[PDB]
């Protein structure tokens, strides 16, 4: 196994996947690494299994259909993985914890949002459809763009949104377009 966490790239108390060489901090993995379970398979492995069991799950889909899907176990897993892929980028630090807004010439968002809140929401089964999760993810970046206006820091929102959107299209097998 790797000697660093796959998500944050640090050493520490790591839990090792039994079916691949990745390792994780307990609360870096999503869901948090399970108490018992020998062998244990990480989220990467669990997502690969879904694909292998249903190869046709990789044919192209329309985003509108994906969003309306109910959060059954497989869609719950896919959203957990997509959230984890965002955390894997170091620029996610900016969006992880609860933000506050006090900048001359701007007003804070009406509905603040952040990664750890989405994380808790998934853990608590608060989303009934994929759309719920995706709307909250996109709101994080949209809030950021609006608040920071012409400051160059706005680009951090663009950057992390692009990681989200690429991973969304991959994980949910969105039909490729120009
Ligand atoms: Zn970690
Ligand atoms: Zn694994
Ligand atoms: Zn099948």
Structure tokens at 7: 């998500």
- C-alpha 170 – ligand 2 centre gap (Å): 18
Residue 60 contacts residue 169 (beta carbons within 8 Å): no
Instruction: For residue 137, give the nearest of 162, 154, 155 by alpha carbon.
Output: 162
- C-alpha 140 – ligand 1 centre gap (Å): 22
- C-alpha 100 – ligand 1 centre gap (Å): 25
Torsion angle, alpha carbons of 170, 67, 177, 74, to 10: 30
Neighbours of 165 (CB within 10 A): 15
- DSSP percent split of the chain into helix, strand, coil, nearest 5: 50, 5, 45
Distance (Å, rounded) from C-alpha 163 to C-alpha 37? 31
The superfamily CATH assigns to domain 1-59 is Zinc/RING finger domain, C3HC4 (zinc finger) (3.30.40.10)
What phi and psi, each to the nearest 5 degrees, are found at residue 109?
-65, 150
- C-alpha 71 – ligand 1 centre gap (Å): 26
Report resolution (Å) to 1 decimal.
1.6
- C-alpha 18 – ligand 1 centre gap (Å): 17
How were these coordinates obtained?
A: X-ray
The superfamily CATH assigns to domain 60-178 is Bromodomain-like (1.20.920.10)
- C-alpha 170 – ligand 3 centre gap (Å): 18
- C-alpha 27 – ligand 1 centre gap (Å): 7
3-state secondary structure 132-178: HHHHHHHHHHHHHHHHHCCCCCHHHHHHHHHHHHHHHHHHCCECCCC
Sorted by where each begins, the domain ranges of the chain are: 1-59, 60-178
- C-alpha 110 – ligand 1 centre gap (Å): 32
What are the C-alpha distances in Å from 24 to residues 81, 88, 119, 137, 144? 14, 11, 17, 23, 29
- C-alpha 54 – ligand 3 centre gap (Å): 3
Distance (Å, rounded) from C-alpha 30 to C-alpha 16? 14
For tokens 């044919």, name the residue: 59
Quick check: helix, strand or coil at residue 27?
Answer: coil
- Roughly how many angstroms between the first and final C-alpha of the chain, as a whole number? 39
Ligand at shortest distance from the CA of 88: 1
Ligand at shortest distance from the CA of 1: 2
């Amino acid at each position: 196994n790797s000697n660093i966490c796959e998500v944050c790239n640090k050493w520490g108390r790591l839990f090792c996947c039994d079916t691949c060489p990745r390792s994780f901090h307990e609360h870096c993995h999503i869901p948090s690494v399970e108490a018992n379970k020998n062998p244990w398979s990480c989220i990467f492995c669990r997502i690969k299994t879904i694909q292998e069991r249903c190869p046709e799950s990789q044919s192209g889909h329309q985003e509108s259909e994906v969003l309306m899907r109910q959060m059954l176990p497989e869609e719950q897993l896919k959203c957990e993985f997509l959230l984890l892929k965002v955390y894997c980028d170091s620029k996610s630090c900016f969006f992880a914890s609860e933000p506050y807004y006090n900048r001359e010439g701007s007003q804070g968002p009406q509905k603040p949002m952040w990664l750890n809140k989405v994380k808790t929401s998934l853990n608590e089964q608060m989303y009934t459809r994929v759309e719920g999760f995706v709307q909250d993810m996109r709101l994080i970046f949209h809030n950021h763009k609006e608040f920071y206006r012409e400051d160059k820091f706005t680009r951090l929102g663009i950057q992390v949104q692009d990681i989200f959107e690429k991973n969304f299209r991959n994980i949910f097998a969105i039909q490729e377009t120009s």
